[PDB]
Design a binder for this molecule. Structure first.
Ligand code: CA
Length: 198
């Protein structure tokens, strides 16, 4: 179908919606799931970025490049990139994207096109687990601090409509519409009203 439920339009100079976790509540995840609906005519833009707290390096970014949707992420080693290179999506029509990561593995799917897949005694036990704990962080998304929607802060402002954003249990755009305490909206971003029914 088209844009359903809570929807925002980004215009002109663009704008930003920011979710900020309270300091004691920042999550660290082994697995992530992200979905959103969008429409735009832009060849290049950033749509959503999740950043860890300052001084830490992990991140996840959903963007459009040369009219193609893609994601880039890092969870403790090298940057990893996945793109749907074979469907042009800057045609001003509604599209859906689904992204998942599970440790080192990840997938990307646009619309209904094929999924793209990327591939002793007391003391000894404690130390061995601490050493395993260390290596495990290289496939965990640590200390998530903000979800920033709209790309302006990254220098690639989005222009178009966004709806139905979901990230790890949070419907972020609905929280924005319900005046959540942890959300801020700035710039040219506007809530689309309800259908009369009609
Ligand atoms: Ca990590």
């Amino acid at each position: 179908g088209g844009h359903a439920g809570t929807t925002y339009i980004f215009s002109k100079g663009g704008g930003q919606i920011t979710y900020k976790w309270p300091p004691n509540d920042r999550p660290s995840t082994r697995a992530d799931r992200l979905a959103i609906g969008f429409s735009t005519v832009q060849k290049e833009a950033v749509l959503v970025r999740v950043d860890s707290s300052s001084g830490l390096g992990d991140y996840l970014e959903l963007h459009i490049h040369q009219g193609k949707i893609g994601v880039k992420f890092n969870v403790g080693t090298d940057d990893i990139a996945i793109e749907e290179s074979n469907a042009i999506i800057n045609d001003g029509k509604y599209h859906v994207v689904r992204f998942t990561r599970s440790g080192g593995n990840a997938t990307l799917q646009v619309d209904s096109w094929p999924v793209i897949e990327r591939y002793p005694y007391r003391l000894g036990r404690v130390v061995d687990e601490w050493l395993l704990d260390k290596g495990r962080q290289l496939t965990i998304f640590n200390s998530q601090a903000t979800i920033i929607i709209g790309g302006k802060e990254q220098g690639q402002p989005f222009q178009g409509q966004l709806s139905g954003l979901y990230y790890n249990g949070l419907k972020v755009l609905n929280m924005a519409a319900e005046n959540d305490a942890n959300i801020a909206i700035v710039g040219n971003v506007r809530l689309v009203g309800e259908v009369p029914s009609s």
